Design a protein around this ligand. Structure first.
Ligand SMILES: [Mg+2]
Ligand SMILES: [Mg+2]
Ligand SMILES: [Mg+2]
Ligand SMILES: [Mg+2]
Ligand SMILES: [Mg+2]
Ligand SMILES: [Mg+2]
Ligand SMILES: [Mg+2]
Ligand SMILES: [Mg+2]
Ligand SMILES: [Mg+2]
Ligand SMILES: [Mg+2]
Ligand SMILES: [Mg+2]
Ligand SMILES: [Mg+2]
Ligand SMILES: [Mg+2]
Ligand SMILES: [Mg+2]
Ligand SMILES: [Mg+2]
Ligand SMILES: [Mg+2]
Ligand SMILES: [Mg+2]
Ligand SMILES: [Mg+2]
Ligand SMILES: [Mg+2]
Ligand SMILES: [Mg+2]
Ligand SMILES: [Mg+2]
Ligand SMILES: [Mg+2]
Ligand SMILES: [Mg+2]
Ligand SMILES: [Mg+2]
Ligand SMILES: [Mg+2]
Ligand SMILES: [Mg+2]
Ligand SMILES: [Mg+2]
Ligand SMILES: [Mg+2]
Ligand SMILES: [Mg+2]
Ligand SMILES: [Mg+2]
Ligand SMILES: [Mg+2]
Ligand SMILES: [Mg+2]
Ligand SMILES: [Mg+2]
Ligand SMILES: [Mg+2]
Ligand SMILES: [Mg+2]
Ligand SMILES: [Mg+2]
Ligand SMILES: [Mg+2]
Ligand SMILES: [Mg+2]
Ligand SMILES: [Mg+2]
Ligand SMILES: [Mg+2]
Ligand SMILES: [Mg+2]
Lengths: 51, 48, 121, 129
RNA sequence: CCCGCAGAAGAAGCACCGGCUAACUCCGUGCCAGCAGCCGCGGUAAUACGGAGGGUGCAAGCGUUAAUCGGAAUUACUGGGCGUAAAGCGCACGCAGGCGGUUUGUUAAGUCAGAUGUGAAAUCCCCGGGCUCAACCUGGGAACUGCAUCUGAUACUGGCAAGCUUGAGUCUCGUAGAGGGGGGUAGAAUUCCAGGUGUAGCGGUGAAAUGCGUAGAGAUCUGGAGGAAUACCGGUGGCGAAGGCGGCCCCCUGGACGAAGACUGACGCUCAGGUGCGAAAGCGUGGGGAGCAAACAGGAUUAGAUACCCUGGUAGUCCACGCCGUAAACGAUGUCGACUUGGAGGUUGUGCCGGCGUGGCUUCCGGAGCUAACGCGUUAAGUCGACCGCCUGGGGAGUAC
RNA sequence: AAAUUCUAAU
C-alpha cells in the first residue's frame, strides 16, 4: 500500500555514526491509520538498526 | 509517537516533547542532543 | 439406565485431576532458580511479566511468577513457591512467596503488606 | 408383551379420567377386584362389577365432582422389574396423609392406615392421591 | 482458692471497598508499572494499578497455599437423558441372563409379625450432676438401621400337582404383489463392418479451437456382428428384516392378508458374548467389452487453471466363484404389549340389501397432551409395563500403542 | 455470459 517492508540505505559523511548510533531498537506509533474504515486508533511498531 | 496528541516521548531518558510535526519534518536533533549529554557523562565516570 | 444395566455395571465417578501436580499435595515447595526472564501475555493484555524457571527438590522443573514491584532474584537463588496460577501467561501455574528464603519483600509497600512479606513500619 | 396387569388397570383408570369417560372396562382377576374394592371403599370410584362365566369382565364407574377428575394421580410402585416391601414402621404417607397408599399384607389388600392399625407390613401396590 | 496495696496504670492487629459481595473520593502513572477466584481493569480526566482520607468484616488473631464433602439433579438408587443440542448398534436369528395370561390345592424360600442371643468400652443424640461459666469430666437411657435361632400369617413373588383359553402356534379355501435362485426369448436405439446414391463440409461452443473429411466425410438406403439396459403402463403405487427389487415366458422357492370351523394348551417377550445377510467403490482368478467414464493427452477460458467447458480415452461399470463389511446404511425416531377426540384420500380382501357394514398395509391435515422451540399427534415425540444398546464441555480424536 | 482480496484498539 504505502512505504517499505524493509528499506536499507547507506549514509556517507562525517561523524555519521557518532550521531545516528542511538536510533537502534523499536519505535512505536499510535494514530488513526490510513487503511482503516472506522475511526479506530491503532498502535504499531517499526524496527531500526544502525551499523 | 502519539499523533492524536502530537507528542513524542523518549523512554531511555524519560523526556517528553510536544513538537511531533517538527520531528517528522526532519528536525530530530533536539531528540539526540540530550541522550549524548547523558551518554558521554558516563564515559568519564567509567575510569575505575 | 435400567436397574439391570446398573447392576451389571455401576456408575463411575470422574478422576478429577489436579492443576498443581508439582507440589504433590504440599502447601509449599523449595527450589533453585535456573533462569530469570520476562514474557508477554495473551490477547488482549500487554505488559512484560516477570517469571522464572525453577528446579524443585522433588525433581520437577516448573515456571513461577514473581509478583510485586521490583525483585532481587538472580540465577541460583533458593526460593519458596506455592500454588496459584497467572491467567494470561501460557504455562504458569505457581507463585513465588515474597519474604521467603532468598526473596525480599516489596519496598515502600503500605497496603496488603502481609501478602508481600513486608514488615510493619 | 403383556407382563403387568395392575398398571394396565391403573393406566386405564388414568386415561379414562383424562379423556372424561363415564366407565372403563377391562379383563378381570382377583387382585384387580381387591384393588377396585379398596378404591370404592375409599371414595375414589362410584362402583365396580364383574360379569361373564368363561371370560369375566371387570367394569369400573368413574366419578367427577366439580366437573373435573377425582383421581388426581395414581401410579404404580412395586413393578415386576423392581419389587418394594415395607415393614409396618416404614409404611409411606401420601400427600402428608391426605392421599392413600395401597398395601397387600398377609391378611389381604388394604390401605396404609388399615395396615398400621393391624400392625402389619406388606407389598406396596400403588400410590393414589 | 481467698485477702490487702498503688495506679488506667503493663496490653490491637489483619484483610477488603467494579459485579458476584457488606463498604467511595482525591492525587501519581499512561496497555508502562502492575492487579486477578471468574467476568475482566490500565492506550494522558482509572470508585479495579500505587499512595492518602474515609468506610466495611473479623479480632489475639487475620490472610494465602494444600487436601476432602457441599453447592453439582454435573454418573441422577433416592434423583438425568438419546428426532434437530453428546447419545438407538445397518438389519435379523438366537444360547446364558432379566421378565411372565388365568383358576384351584399344597409348601413357607422371598415377605410380614412376635420372642430370644449377640451387636465391647469410648464416640453421636436426650434428661441430670461437678469444675465461678464454657471447653472438659461424668450417671441413666435411647440408638447401633445388622446377623442367627424358635413360633406363627398366607395377600403378593417363587417351587410342586391338576387345570382353562383370551397370548402364541397348526390345519381347510382363496387374494394380491418390481420378494428370491436358474434358463430362454422379443423390440427400439447407440457402435463397428461391407456395399449403392451423392458432394463440400461435419462436429462443438457463450465464441472458438483441438478432432473427422476430396484417400469421398456428415446425410441417406441395404445386409451382418456384438454388448448393456428394458420407453409407454408408472401412480407420496406394491413387495421385503434391512441393504434393495421394474420387458415377456417357464422351473424351483420364502413370507403377508382374508372368511367360517376344527386342534395344542403359556409352548411367550427381550437379548451381553455368538452366528448370518449387508448399496457403491475396492481386491484375486478366468471370461467379456456396444455405451459411459477416475487416471492420462490435447484445445480453450484465466493474472495463474494440476478445475468447471470441448475432443479423445485406460482401469472400472457386465458374468462365475472367493474376499472386503463400510454409507447422510436417515423416519438422523431399538424391539414387544395395553389405553386415549376427528377429517380427507390410496391400495387389497370379505358379509347384507348403487347403499349399509367389517379386516390388513399406507399418504396428508389437525384436537387434548407433550416439547426449549421447531414440531409429533391412535403409524405419538401422549399415558404406562418388560428387556437391550448408548451419552456426560469444545479441540487433541474415533487418533497413537 | 465476466470477476480475487479488505491485518491489528472501540
Ligand atoms: Mg455493594
Ligand atoms: Mg488489591
Ligand atoms: Mg487520574
Ligand atoms: Mg452428587
Ligand atoms: Mg467441587
Ligand atoms: Mg433414574
Ligand atoms: Mg441432561
Ligand atoms: Mg446429534
Ligand atoms: Mg435404526
Ligand atoms: Mg430363557
Ligand atoms: Mg422364572
Ligand atoms: Mg419364611
Ligand atoms: Mg423378623
Ligand atoms: Mg457401642
Ligand atoms: Mg403361587
Ligand atoms: Mg410375484
Ligand atoms: Mg419377482
Ligand atoms: Mg457409405
Ligand atoms: Mg411394506
Ligand atoms: Mg409361501
Ligand atoms: Mg409365492
Ligand atoms: Mg381341551
Ligand atoms: Mg428377537
Ligand atoms: Mg451382538
Ligand atoms: Mg461392485
Ligand atoms: Mg472393482
Ligand atoms: Mg474384478
Ligand atoms: Mg479381469
Ligand atoms: Mg466419451
Ligand atoms: Mg489439460
Ligand atoms: Mg457407522
Ligand atoms: Mg438408503
Ligand atoms: Mg443413526
Ligand atoms: Mg404401540
Ligand atoms: Mg400433523
Ligand atoms: Mg424431546
Ligand atoms: Mg407410542
Ligand atoms: Mg411411546
Ligand atoms: Mg483406526
Ligand atoms: Mg492475498
Ligand atoms: Mg476486517
Amino acid at each position: 500500500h504505502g512505504g517499505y517492508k524493509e528499506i536499507i540505505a547507506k549514509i556517507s559523511g562525517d561523524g555519521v555514526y557518532g550521531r545516528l548510533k542511538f536510533e537502534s531498537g523499536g519505535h512505536r506509533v499510535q494514530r488513526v491509520p490510513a487503511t482503516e474504515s472506522q475511526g479506530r486508533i491503532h498502535t504499531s511498531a517499526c524496527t531500526v538498526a544502525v551499523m | 509517537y502519539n499523533f492524536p496528541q502530537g507528542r513524542v516521548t523518549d523512554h531511555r531518558i524519560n523526556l517528553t516533547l510536544y513538537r511531533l510535526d517538527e520531528v517528522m519534518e526532519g528536525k530530530l536533533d533536539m531528540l539526540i542532543e540530550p541522550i549524548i549529554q547523558e551518554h558521554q557523562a558516563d564515559q568519564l565516570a567509567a575510569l575505575s | 439406565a435400567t436397574v439391570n444395566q446398573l447392576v451389571r455395571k455401576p456408575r463411575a465417578r470422574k478422576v478429577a485431576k489436579s492443576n498443581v501436580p508439582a507440589l504433590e499435595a504440599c502447601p509449599q515447595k523449595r527450589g533453585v532458580c535456573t533462569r530469570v526472564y520476562t514474557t508477554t501475555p495473551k490477547k488482549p493484555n500487554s505488559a512484560l511479566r516477570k517469571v522464572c524457571r525453577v528446579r524443585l527438590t522433588n525433581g520437577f522443573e516448573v515456571t513461577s511468577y514473581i509478583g510485586g514491584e521490583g525483585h532481587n532474584l538472580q540465577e541460583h537463588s533458593v526460593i519458596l513457591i506455592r500454588g496459584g496460577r497467572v491467567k494470561d501467561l501460557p504455562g504458569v501455574r505457581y507463585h513465588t512467596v515474597r519474604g521467603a528464603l532468598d526473596c525480599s519483600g516489596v519496598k515502600d509497600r503500605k497496603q496488603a503488606r502481609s501478602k508481600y512479606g513486608v514488615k510493619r513500619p | 408383551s403383556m407382563q403387568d396387569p395392575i398398571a394396565d388397570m391403573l393406566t386405564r383408570i388414568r386415561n379414562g379420567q383424562a379423556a372424561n369417560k363415564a366407565a372403563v372396562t377391562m379383563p378381570s382377576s382377583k387382585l384387580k377386584v381387591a384393588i377396585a374394592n379398596v378404591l370404592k371403599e375409599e371414595g375414589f370410584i362410584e362402583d365396580f362389577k364383574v360379569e361373564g362365566d368363561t371370560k369375566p369382565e371387570l367394569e369400573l364407574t368413574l366419578k367427577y365432582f366439580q366437573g373435573k377428575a377425582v383421581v388426581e394421580s395414581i401410579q404404580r410402585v412395586s413393578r415386576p422389574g423392581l419389587r418394594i416391601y415395607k415393614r409396618k414402621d416404614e409404611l409411606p404417607k401420601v400427600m402428608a396423609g391426605l392421599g392413600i397408599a395401597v398395601v397387600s399384607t398377609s391378611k389381604g389388600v388394604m390401605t396404609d392406615r388399615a395396615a398400621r392399625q393391624a400392625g402389619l407390613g406388606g407389598e406396596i401396590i400403588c400410590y393414589v392421591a
